[PDB]
Amino acid sequence: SGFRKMAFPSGKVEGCMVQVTCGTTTLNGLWLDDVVYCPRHVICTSEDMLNPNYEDLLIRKSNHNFLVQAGNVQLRVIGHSMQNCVLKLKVDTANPKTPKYKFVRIQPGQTFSVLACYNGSPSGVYQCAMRPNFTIKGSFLNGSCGSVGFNIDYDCVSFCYMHHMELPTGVHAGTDLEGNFYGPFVDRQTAQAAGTDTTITVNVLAWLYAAVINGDRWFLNRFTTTLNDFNLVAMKYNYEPLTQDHVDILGPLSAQTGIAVLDMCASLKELLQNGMNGRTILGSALLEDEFTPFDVVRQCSGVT
Amino acid sequence: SGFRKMAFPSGKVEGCMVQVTCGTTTLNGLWLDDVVYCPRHVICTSEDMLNPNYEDLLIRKSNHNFLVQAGNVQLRVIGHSMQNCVLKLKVDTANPKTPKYKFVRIQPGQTFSVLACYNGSPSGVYQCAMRPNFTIKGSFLNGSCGSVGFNIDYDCVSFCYMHHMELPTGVHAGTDLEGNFYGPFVDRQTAQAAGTDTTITVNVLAWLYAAVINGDRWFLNRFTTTLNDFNLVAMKYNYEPLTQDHVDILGPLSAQTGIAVLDMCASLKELLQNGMNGRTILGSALLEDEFTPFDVVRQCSGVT
Ligand SMILES: CCCCOc1ccc(Cl)cc1CC(=O)Nc1cnccc1C
């Protein structure tokens, strides 16, 4: 019993972190096999960031200008290339701590763990969701760029995020490991609209099932609803519209608890319309949307 | 910017986890140097748990009855001893992944990371506080016993908790690494009062400073208070009384923000008396007490 915002064990990712320095800029890189991946803005000076011509800035750099250090040891750079917003530095040594891995592009509403790093050294690990608007609400300071987001299925690390920047609003933006930004963001110091965010309905419902499993049941009611009626409420409260695909993904939790998905929707509808009335659910005084249905099943079953 | 419930990177601890089996019971052990530490109730059957005579149960066990497996490899047990509520299994091989470590007994109100494990395999990592009543509000299922709590200062892991049991109320109890329970708990399947818990005032104040640093400032007011007046409010709301020692530990945050500790106390007093009025602070709709002043300084400065 108990339910926590749990991150994946970060060891397999810690073994991949390196420091990358180019000129005066230092950030983090991810060393997998014989390639080090890092944000391409490592080649910029603070002055270049207003509108960088990355192609031109990279033309002025050679392999020997990229200083890559894995803890105490220096890596020898034998190639460099830019792919979208990431640089790939080919090194002469395969990382001996390379775990089994994949590069994946996550969908908005999915969750992942972030290993925040500074100077190639891990500082902490936390779990977060990719917002529907493709931002993340992380905890990152200057020097954290190149820190990565990931999920782990048994012995395979699926890397889904590399941190690039903080928007003027304090929210975070980054790329997949092929350097493609999530969302409309560009790697420039410019005003960038993040766009309307919504609450991840399927995750709130999953977390309400997690609450029932762990004994917090006060919000259960005698009501039911339909997808159409619930979506009118979701619209008013800036929640993502619930679809049959979301209902299907909640099947295992509905089967375990015996609470039909639309009955849990009616509990959520009442909570949206009436608030918490000063009560809490799983130690929270708001409706939590950073746990997917898969996260709830994993945490409630003890998957390693 | 941003503030998250951040755990320490768990890699150094993952390398110490092993599975311990005795008879029919399997739980986790912590392998440091040539000793494996685990909860002594690994020697019990479910029937023995109502009132186990651990000394008698252990007398029936020999070194070869403790099956210790580090991933795929089996460890050879050459000695066993019980120290308080832990068993120490001497093995013939020092763990090659033993980090620099210490065993510490944390104080109530302090925080630490938990690497939840099942069958010797890490499942996830989360940050939590040792409650003033010596329980932890963790996320643990059957098989998680032997999972550990720790803090990391540079390259040194300070182990402070080993998980032993879930109380009938769903809260968690465990020991330091010398096997001494935190709180009044005993390792028996009996009704055990946890005792009155309180909110960790110094941590709520630290988190309010974290909020101001990250831009959430709506709760700041034109008021001040005294330790005596604030403690009358703390008493009414079941908060720990604030002392000058707590004020001194908040010095660095008060110096960084320029907000005097008693002025932040007046913000906290108003929040206690008036509630949040449907607003949030650092994404929370309640007053968070699981960040110490040291945690806030560390997260706000990027300590690795
Ligand atoms: C001090 C850097 C100012 C320019 O910023 C930038 C402009 C554009 C880009 Cl693609 C990158 C960056 C660096 C950046 O955003 N760093 C960062 C990340 N997360 C949290 C806090 C910080 C300060």
Ligand SMILES: CCCCOc1ccc(Cl)cc1CC(=O)Nc1cnccc1C
């Ligand atoms: C299924 C075990 C029942 C007896 O429990 C016990 C009685 C006494 C003791 Cl010192 C240990 C235990 C085992 C225990 O509490 N396990 C556990 C831990 N955390 C979260 C969930 C669980 C089920």
